[PDB]
């Protein structure tokens, strides 16, 4: 008495009436206190098949974020196509709280438990809760922040491996720390990782990626061209827009199980040029939004590196190469939304 069955979602949090910042503020007027207790329904000898590709969850995440995006960064100026609305943006206490998505009376939502599922195709262990857990809105290019990891191996997820314009998303088993910084230019910033961990990561990642194509060299290479958001690693601190350059972190061969990167510094540890923006492309709509210039202070943000988003270079030899991608903030919430999918209990 089960099957796939498209219902509106309502989210919960722990988010806290009294506290200013905007993810609190939204989430308190618009979700439900958590549970917060609710129990997995574990089943067995039953199978179902998941695309992670193809799920309406997603698009109800999206949206909200969205509307959550509305309220909380206002922009000074919100430029579409020759038509331009001006309005207060204040600046304004902004930190991502975990949201759990939950399925009203008469639907549930099935979890696969299979360490290794990749997204897609049958699920031989699955389960039954009311809520997800929690997930972190943070919307970010190229690296996905502050997401959960893979409890065994490293997961590569794609629509079409073949497809070299599908999105390929690598959930690490293994969080490599990134700490971006403003120190008290004003719009000038940098973030730091350390190579030895990075370098770890790329190797693994490296290998799954080997185990995925005939042993050809396996090449990582700055995002090719396009905008600002998406040939860089670009992400929200405290309110700020950060536009870190990735181009000494995804520089690198490894081919023949071995590991060889570039771009490091004494200490060991690889530096990102950063520039705060006040003009951005937005990903919510096609249209350009002006903020304001940045407040005063330190302004960092220390967070866990939990995945990548890639993309082949395919074309019609011995050579496969990777590059940075994102751009479609979807594809940040599929990577946190491959476990679930809504059934009717019917
Ligand atoms: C995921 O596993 C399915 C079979 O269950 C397979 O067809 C598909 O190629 C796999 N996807 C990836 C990207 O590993
Ligand atoms: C992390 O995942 C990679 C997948 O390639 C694996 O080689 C490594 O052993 C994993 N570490 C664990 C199991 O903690
Ligand atoms: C994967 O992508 C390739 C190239 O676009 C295509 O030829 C093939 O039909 C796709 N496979 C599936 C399962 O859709
Ligand atoms: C980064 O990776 C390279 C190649 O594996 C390694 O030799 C190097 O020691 C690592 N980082 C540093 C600076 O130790
Ligand atoms: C990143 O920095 C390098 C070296 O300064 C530069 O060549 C490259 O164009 C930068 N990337 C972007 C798109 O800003
Ligand atoms: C890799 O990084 C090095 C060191 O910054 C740089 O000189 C080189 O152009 C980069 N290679 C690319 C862009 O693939
Ligand atoms: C990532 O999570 C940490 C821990 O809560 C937080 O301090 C940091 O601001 C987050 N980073 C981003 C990009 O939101
Ligand atoms: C960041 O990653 C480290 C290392 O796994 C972990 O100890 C810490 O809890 C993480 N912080 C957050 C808020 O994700």
Do not use: C
């Given at each position: 008495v089960w099957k796939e069955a498209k219902t509106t979602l309502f989210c919960a949090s722990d988010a806290?009436?009294?506290?200013?910042?905007v993810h609190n503020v939204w989430a308190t007027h618009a979700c439900v206190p958590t549970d917060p207790n609710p129990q997995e329904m574990v089943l067995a000898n039953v199978t179902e098949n998941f695309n992670m590709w193809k799920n309406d969850m997603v698009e109800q995440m999206h949206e909200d974020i969205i509307s959550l995006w509305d309220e909380?960064?206002?922009?000074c100026v919100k430029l579409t196509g020759g038509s331009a609305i001006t309005q207060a943006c204040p600046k304004v206490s902004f930190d991502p709280i975990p949201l759990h998505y939950c399925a009203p009376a008469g639907f549930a939502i099935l979890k696969c438990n299979?360490?290794?599922?990749?997204?897609?195709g049958p699920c031989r262990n699955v389960s039954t809760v009311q809520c997800t857990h929690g997930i972190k809105p943070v919307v970010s290019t190229q690296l996905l922040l502050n997401g959960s990891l893979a409890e065994e191996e490293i997961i590569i997820r794609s629509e079409?491996?073949?497809?070299?314009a599908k999105t390929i998303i690598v959930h690490l088993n293994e969080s490599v720390n990134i700490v971006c910084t403003r120190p008290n230019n004003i719009r000038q910033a940098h973030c730091n990782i350390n190579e030895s961990k990075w370098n770890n990561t790329l190797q693994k990642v490296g290998e799954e990626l080997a185990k995925h194509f005939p042993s050809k060299t396996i090449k990582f290479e700055p995002?090719?061209?396009?905008?600002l958001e998406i040939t860089t690693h670009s992400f929200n601190c405290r309110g700020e827009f950060f536009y870190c350059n990735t181009s000494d972190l995804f520089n690198g061969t490894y081919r023949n199980g071995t590991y060889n990167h570039t771009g490091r510094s004494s200490n060991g540890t690889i530096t990102l040029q950063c520039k705060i923006k006040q003009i951005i492309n937005m990903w919510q709509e096609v249209g350009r939004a002006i903020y304001a210039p940045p407040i005063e202070g330190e302004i960092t943000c220390n967070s866990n590196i939990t995945g990548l988003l890639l993309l082949r270079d395919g074309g019609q030899n011995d050579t496969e190469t990777f590059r940075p991608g994102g751009g479609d903030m979807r594809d940040n919430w599929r990577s946190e939304l491959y476990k679930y999918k809504v059934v009717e209990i019917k």
């Open positions: 806290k009436a009294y506290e200013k910042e909380s960064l206002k922009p299979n360490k290794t599922f990749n997204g897609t079409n491996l073949t497809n070299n995002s090719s061209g396009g905008d």
